[PDB]
Curated annotation (Swiss-Prot), chain A:
The chain holds residues 176 to 228 of 485 of the full protein. It comes from Pseudomonas aeruginosa (strain ATCC 15692 / DSM 22644 / CIP 104116 / JCM 14847 / LMG 12228 / 1C / PRS 101 / PAO1). It is found in: Cell outer membrane. Component of the MexAB-OprM multidrug efflux complex, composed of six MexA subunits forming a hexameric tube, binding to a MexB trimer, which interact with the trimeric OprM outer membrane channel protein. The OprM homotrimer forms a 135 Angstroms-long pore. It consists of a beta-barrel, which is probably inserted in the outer membrane, and an alpha-barrel formed by alpha-helices which probably spans the periplasm. In the ground state the periplasmic end is closed, while the outer membrane end opening is 6-8 Angstroms in diameter. Induction: By growth under severe iron limitation. The lineage of its organism: Bacteria, Pseudomonadati, Pseudomonadota, Gammaproteobacteria, Pseudomonadales. Disruption phenotype: Disruption of MexA, MexB and OprM significantly reduces active efflux of N-(3-oxododecanoyl) homoserine lactone/3-oxo-C12-HSL/PAI-1, but not N-butyryl homoserine lactone/C4-HSL/PAI-2. This is Outer membrane protein OprM.
Swiss-Prot record, chain B:
Component of the MexAB-OprM multidrug efflux complex, composed of six MexA subunits forming a hexameric tube, binding to a MexB trimer, which interact with the trimeric OprM outer membrane channel protein. OprM is thought to not directly contact MexB; instead, MexA joins MexB and OprM by forming a funnel-like hexamer anchored to the inner membrane. MexA may initially form a hexameric ring complex with MexB prior to OprM, then OprM undergoes a conformational change as it contacts MexA, allowing the periplasmic gate to open. Induction: By growth under severe iron limitation. It is found in: Cell inner membrane. The periplasmic linker component of the MexAB-OprM efflux system that confers multidrug resistance. Functions as the major efflux pump for n-hexane and p-xylene efflux. Has been shown in one study to be involved in the active efflux of the autoinducer N-(3-oxododecanoyl) homoserine lactone, thereby playing an indirect role in quorum-sensing; but has been shown in another study not to be involved in efflux of this autoinducer. Over-expression of the pump increases antibiotic and solvent efflux capacities. Implicated in the secretion of the siderophore pyoverdine. It comes from Pseudomonas aeruginosa (strain ATCC 15692 / DSM 22644 / CIP 104116 / JCM 14847 / LMG 12228 / 1C / PRS 101 / PAO1). This is Multidrug resistance protein MexA. Changing R45D: Abolishes complex formation and thereby decreases drug resistance.
Length: 53, 52
C-alpha cells in the first residue's frame, strides 16, 4: 500500500509540475505583452507591476 | 504583437480619421477667412473697406 501511494503521489505531482510550468509560461507571455504595451506607451507602470507580481 | 484587440485598433483608427475630418472642417472654415479670389481678372473697387 505505501509503495502504491508513494508512486501515485509521484506521478500526480509530475502532472502538477507540468501544469504549473504551463502557468509560468502563460504569465511570462502576458508579461512580455504588458512590457511591450508599456514600452510603446499605452499601459502605465502599475499594470507592469501587476504583471511582475 | 497582438497585445491589444483587432477591434480596439479599428475604433481608434476611426476616431483618428473622423477627428482628422474635424480638423479639415476647421481648416477650411479658417481658409474661408482669407477671402481668396474665386476667379481671375480685373478687380474693381472695394464696396466695403477695412473695419466694417
Amino acid at each position: 500500500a505505501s509503495v502504491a501511494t508513494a508512486y501515485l503521489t509521484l506521478k500526480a505531482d509530475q502532472a502538477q509540475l507540468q501544469l504549473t510550468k504551463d502557468t509560468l509560461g502563460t504569465y511570462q507571455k502576458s508579461f512580455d505583452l504588458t512590457q511591450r504595451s508599456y514600452d510603446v506607451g499605452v499601459a502605465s507602470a502599475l499594470d507592469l507591476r501587476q504583471a511582475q507580481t | 504583437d497582438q497585445a491589444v484587440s483587432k477591434q480596439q485598433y479599428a475604433d481608434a483608427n476611426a476616431a483618428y480619421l473622423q477627428s482628422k475630418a474635424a480638423v479639415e472642417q476647421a481648416r477650411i472654415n479658417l481658409r474661408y477667412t482669407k477671402v481668396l479670389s474665386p476667379i481671375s481678372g480685373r478687380i474693381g473697387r472695394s464696396a466695403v473697406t477695412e473695419g466694417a
